[PDB]
Amino acid sequence: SGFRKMAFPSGKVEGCMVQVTCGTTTLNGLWLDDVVYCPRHVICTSEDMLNPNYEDLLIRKSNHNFLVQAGNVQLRVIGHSMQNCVLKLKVDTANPKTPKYKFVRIQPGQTFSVLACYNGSPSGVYQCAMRPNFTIKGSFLNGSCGSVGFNIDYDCVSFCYMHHMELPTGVHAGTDLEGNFYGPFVDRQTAQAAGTDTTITVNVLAWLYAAVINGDRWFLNRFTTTLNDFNLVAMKYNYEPLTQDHVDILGPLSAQTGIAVLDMCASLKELLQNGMNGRTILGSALLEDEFTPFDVVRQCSGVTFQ
Amino acid sequence: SGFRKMAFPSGKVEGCMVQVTCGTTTLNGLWLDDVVYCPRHVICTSEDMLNPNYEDLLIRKSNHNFLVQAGNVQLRVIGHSMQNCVLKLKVDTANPKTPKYKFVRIQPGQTFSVLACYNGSPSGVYQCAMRPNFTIKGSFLNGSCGSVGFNIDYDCVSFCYMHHMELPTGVHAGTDLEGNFYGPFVDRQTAQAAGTDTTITVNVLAWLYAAVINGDRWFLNRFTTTLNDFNLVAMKYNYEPLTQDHVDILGPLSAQTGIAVLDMCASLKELLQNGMNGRTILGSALLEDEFTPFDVVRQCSGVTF
């Protein structure tokens, strides 16, 4: 029993974190095999960030201008290249701790673990979600760029995020491991702001199913709804539209609890209208949206507390 | 910016988890040097759990009755002993991944990371606190016994909890690594319940400081209070009494924000008496009490391991 915001064990990723230095800038890098991946903005000054010409800044750099430190060992850079917004530094040593891995680009609503790092040293691990506005609500200080997000379904690490920037509202932006930003963001200090964010409806429904599995049903009601009427109501509370894909994805949680997806949608419509009236759901007074259907199945018992 | 429930990196602990089997029971063990630590209830059957005589059950066991598996390797047990509610299995191989470590017993209000494990394989990591009633609000299913809680200081892992049991209210109970239970619990299938819990006041104050550091200031006010008047309010809302030690501990946060501890106590008093009025603090509609003053300082400073 119980339900917590649970991150994947970070050991496989800790063994890949290194420090990358270029001039007076130091940030984190991810060392997989003989390549170190890091944000290309490591080659910029503060002044460069207004209108950086990355190709022009990079052509003036040699391999020996990049210092890579893994623990207390200095790695030798033997090649460099830029791929989108990521710098790839070829090193003379393959990481002996390289786990089995993949690079995966995720969609809004998907969750992942973040291993926050400073100076190539891991400091903490936490769970987060890619928001519908393509930002993440992380916890990152200056020096955390290059920290990565990942999932570890089975013994394979799927890297999905590399940290690049903090927006004026205190939320965060970054790229996949091929250097493509999530969202319309750029690694340039422009007028960039997070777009209006919305609640991840499919995740709130998954978390309501988690509460039922854990033994709570106070929020259920005798009503159902059509998908269209549910969406008309949801959008009035800044909730994302629920699609037929989301209904299909909720199928196994619907079967384990005996509550049809549209029946759970009617419960969510009522909670949006009434609030909780002094009650909590899984120890929260707000409707939680950073647990996916997959996360609930991963954590919860396969047996409902009826 | 940002404030999350953050756990310590779990790698040093992952390298210590093993599976321990005795008969038809399988649970997790902690392998440090040549000893594997696990709950002594691994030697019990379902019927034995009803009223176990652990010394009598243990004397009938040989070393070869314990199967220890580390990854895909079978470790050979060469000795066994009991220390309080923990079984110590001496093995023929020292763990090559043993980190620098200590066994520490924590006090209520202190937080730690839990590495949830099943069949000797780590599944997830989360943060929690030792409640004033000595239970933890964990997330554990059957097979999680032997999972451990810990903190890290530089390169040293301080192991503080080993999981043993789930109570009827869905909360959890366990021991330190010397096998002493936190709370008035016993390792037997008998009627046991979590006592009435209280809110960890010093931790709520620490989290209010974290909200100020992050830009949430709406709850601040011009008022102050005495420690005695604050405690008269706190007792009425099932909050733990705030001591001069707690005030001293909040000093490094009181100086970094310019808000005196008793000034923040006056904000907490008004929050208790009036509520949040539709507002949230760090994305929460409840007053969060599972961040210690040290956790706030560490997350707002970037301490590494």
Ligand SMILES: CC[C@H]1CN(c2cncc3ccccc23)C(=O)[C@@]12CN(S(=O)(=O)CC1(C#N)CC1)Cc1ccc(Cl)cc12
């Ligand atoms: C090039 C250095 C990075 C570092 N950084 C940060 C990353 N994570 C956490 C941080 C927390 C504190 C301060 C910096 C943080 C960034 O946002 C920087 C620096 N900033 S900044 O200082 O204006 C950012 C900010 C605002 N608004 C003050 C928060 C411009 C910029 C523009 C594009 C990109 Cl891709 C990165 C960056």
Ligand SMILES: CC[C@H]1CN(c2cncc3ccccc23)C(=O)[C@@]12CN(S(=O)(=O)CC1(C#N)CC1)Cc1ccc(Cl)cc12
């Ligand atoms: C001997 C097996 C352990 C396993 N366990 C569990 C540990 N964590 C999470 C679990 C979640 C699901 C079921 C078991 C859980 C326990 O609480 C057991 C089994 N239980 S029980 O099944 O009656 C407990 C319960 C209640 N109330 C139904 C939850 C008796 C008992 C008594 C003393 C001790 Cl030290 C341990 C235990």
Ligand SMILES: [Cl-]
């Ligand atoms: Cl995805």
